[PDB]
Write a protein that binds this ligand. Structure first.
Ligand SMILES: Nc1ncnc2c1ncn2[C@@H]1O[C@H](COP(=O)(O)OP(=O)(O)O)[C@@H](O)[C@H]1O
Ligand SMILES: [Br-]
Ligand SMILES: [Br-]
Ligand SMILES: [Br-]
Ligand SMILES: [Br-]
Ligand SMILES: [Mn+2]
Ligand SMILES: [Mn+2]
Ligand SMILES: [Mn+2]
Ligand SMILES: [Mn+2]
Ligand SMILES: [Mn+2]
Ligand SMILES: [Mn+2]
Ligand SMILES: [Mn+2]
Ligand SMILES: [Mn+2]
Ligand code: NA
Ligand code: NA
Length: 168
């Protein structure tokens, strides 16, 4: 089933600003519902060990999301991963980046353990999330944006708004 609305994915390393940006979109743009996928994964135990996610866990998540994604209205999906989702769902994929100094501080203030913080810092340096998104979706719908400041966030949301209007 083809989506009835406009669907956006916001992805990027933990701490890059996905949830913040998705909530800005849901607040500022017309008719967007935010799906915080990490919360779905927790709430529904869509994982094997919230850590290890196996093939079957992905399948169950997708079955849960499918009816939402094809429903009327617009959706802004927020998740650190992207390869798992069908290209059918999305009209835009936004990948957020953050400078290492800014990211480190966010991860500290948000209280990640030192190991998880370092793991996430390395993932950002290695461009894991961006490479995944570019491998999984058509290059023309992928927007990559530096997201260090609130001014940057707002400008990105303006670019999204412009792109959405075109799609609409
Ligand atoms: N563009 C931005 N400019 C400044 N601070 C930001 C920005 N985006 C996010 N933040 C800060 O980083 C914190 C964590 O961001 P969050 O949206 O939770 O990231 P993610 O969902 O990618 O893990 C926010 O609570 C806020 O303090
Ligand atoms: Br809009
Ligand atoms: Br949600
Ligand atoms: Br997430
Ligand atoms: Br700022
Ligand atoms: Mn988040
Ligand atoms: Mn929300
Ligand atoms: Mn997860
Ligand atoms: Mn599968
Ligand atoms: Mn809907
Ligand atoms: Mn510790
Ligand atoms: Mn983490
Ligand atoms: Mn693909
Ligand atoms: Na791959
Ligand atoms: Na590749």
């Amino acid at each position: 089933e083809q989506p009835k609305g406009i669907n956006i994915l916001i992805t990027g390393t933990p701490g890059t600003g996905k949830t913040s940006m998705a909530e800005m979109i849901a607040a500022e743009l017309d008719g967007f519902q935010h799906l915080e996928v990490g919360k779905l994964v927790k709430e529904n135990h869509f994982y094997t060990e919230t850590h290890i996610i196996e093939e079957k866990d992905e399948d169950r998540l997708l079955d849960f999301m499918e009816p939402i994604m094809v429903s009327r209205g617009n959706h802004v999906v927020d998740y650190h991963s992207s390869e798992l989702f069908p290209e059918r769902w999305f009209h835009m994929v936004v990948v957020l980046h953050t400078s290492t100094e800014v990211l480190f501080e966010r991860l500290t203030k948000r209280q990640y353990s030192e190991a998880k913080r370092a793991e996430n810092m390395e993932a950002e340096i290695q461009c894991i999330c961006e490479e995944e998104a570019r491998d999984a979706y058509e290059d023309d719908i992928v927007l990559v944006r530096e997201n260090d400041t609130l001014e940057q966030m707002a400008a990105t949301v303006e670019e999204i708004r412009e792109r959405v209007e075109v799609l609409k």
